[PDB]
């Protein structure tokens with residue numbers, strides 16, 4: 401009565417017939433009753449193409465209970481060109497996606513160039529939330545995304561828990577969870593196996609808390625890349641605690657582009673265990689993957705970044721603070737860092753600091769003796785206070 405099973409609205413659940421129409425119809429029914437649940441039942445597999453579940457004409461507090469499997473079409477005709485997301489939830493209040501079922505993007509057809517006369521640089525995000533207040537994602541697994549697994553854009557009050565991504569470590573650009581223009585988020589008790597950043601925090605994000613997460617494979621937990629194409633980025637109050645990273649290319653990273661502007665401030669990375677991680681601790685203001693590697697006079701201002709209790713083994717550079725000549729990093733603090741080289745090659749690479757100011761609160765392994773204790777008039781002279789933040 402209160403639970404709208406998609407099979408009662410025309411869905412075939414055979415994996416082969418297109419059930420998109422049926423899902424839209426079930427959504428329209430669920431949208432009319434509060435406390436309603438749209439159930440995608442266990443024991444069935446549903447082929448669903450691009451779809452947008454709109455909240456504008458819908459109700460608030462809806463539950464989308466995914467217990468079976470939703471699979472993406474592999475035919476190019478299902479997608480058209482320029483589509484940035486497969487499944488979208490837009491303008492919802494209090495939406496919950498829960499259950500122990502699976503979203504499978506069949507991403508290998510995209511990674512592997514089987515769509516269209518031509519591969520798009522940016523492929524669809526599997527599950528995207530836009531413009532929503534009070535979003536919960538729990539329980540589900542997203543596997544084999546065409547690109548990003550889960551995205552939050554312009555959302556507030558987000559909770560992600562008991563959540564899993566699974567795409568191959570060598571799949572291109574398959575980041576786990578991406579946030580942009582989103583605030584007041586908690587991501588916890590989740591397992592992220594990705595081909596790119598496990599968690600990527602982009603501009604406009606603040607008050608993000610990540611804890612009790614396992615990453616690997618993937619590229620680590622990253623703020624950025626910020627400021628590409630001479631743009632302004634603002635990120636503040638990011639906490640990452642109690643995370644284990646296995647065979648990722650970075651551990652905890654902040655990356656920004658030369659020519660960017662704005663500010664990344666008040667970041668805490670604590671209780672991080674790394675196992676065979678290439679670059680465990682990195683601030684890179686020379687980031688240029690996918691573009692030009694020239695220098696420019698503007699930078700994103702990085703300040704008040706704290707690293708506490710980070711231990712394990714590394715395979716490339718243990719610590720790299722590569723900050724802009726035009727705007728040094730400041731307020732970097734390190735405590736209780738115990739990193740051991742996993743390979744001989746790694747053992748020959750010492751910490752690297754460039755234009756980085758801060759303090760060592762304890763001795764570290766390897767020793768970090770390149771952080772500058774003096775203040776930076778250069779950093780203080782660039783206006784990166786009121787352009788980004790009101791407090």
Ligand SMILES: *[C@@H]1O[C@H](CO)[C@@H](O[C@@H]2O[C@H](CO)[C@@H](O[C@@H]3O[C@H](CO[C@H]4O[C@H](CO)[C@@H](O)[C@H](O[C@H]5O[C@H](CO)[C@@H](O)[C@H](O)[C@@H]5O)[C@@H]4O)[C@@H](O)[C@H](O[C@H]4O[C@H](CO)[C@@H](O)[C@H](O)[C@@H]4O)[C@@H]3O)[C@H](O)[C@H]2NC(C)=O)[C@H](O)[C@H]1NC(C)=O
Pocket residue numbers: 686693694695722723725752753754755770
């Ligand atoms: C874009 O812009 C970037 C940033 O400028 C360019 O990349 C930089 O290129 C330069 C030149 O090739 C590199 O410089 C070398 O840096 C090393 C490393 O320095 C660091 O490590 C030292 C310990 O190994 C440490 O002492 C250094 O700190 C001191 O020096 C800095 C620099 O003045 C100073 O700020 C500190 O207070 C310290 O005094 C630093 O942490 C350094 O060893 C090299 O110097 C040796 O060689 C030079 C000349 O060859 C010699 O004169 C010196 O006395 C010394 O013997 C040298 O400075 C730098 O590493 C690059 N930085 C990054 C982040 O990559 C890049 O090329 C530009 N790109 C383009 C396309 O333009």
Ligand SMILES: *[C@@H]1O[C@H](CO)[C@@H](O[C@@H]2O[C@H](CO)[C@@H](O)[C@H](O)[C@H]2NC(C)=O)[C@H](O)[C@H]1NC(C)=O
Pocket residue numbers: 584585606607608609637
């Ligand atoms: C910095 O971010 C943290 C985490 O987002 C904020 O603390 C949370 O604030 C919410 C209110 O929105 C509380 O319900 C949570 O209990 C807080 N979480 C934790 C772990 O404490 C904090 O408010 C932010 N700081 C500022 C000044 O905004």
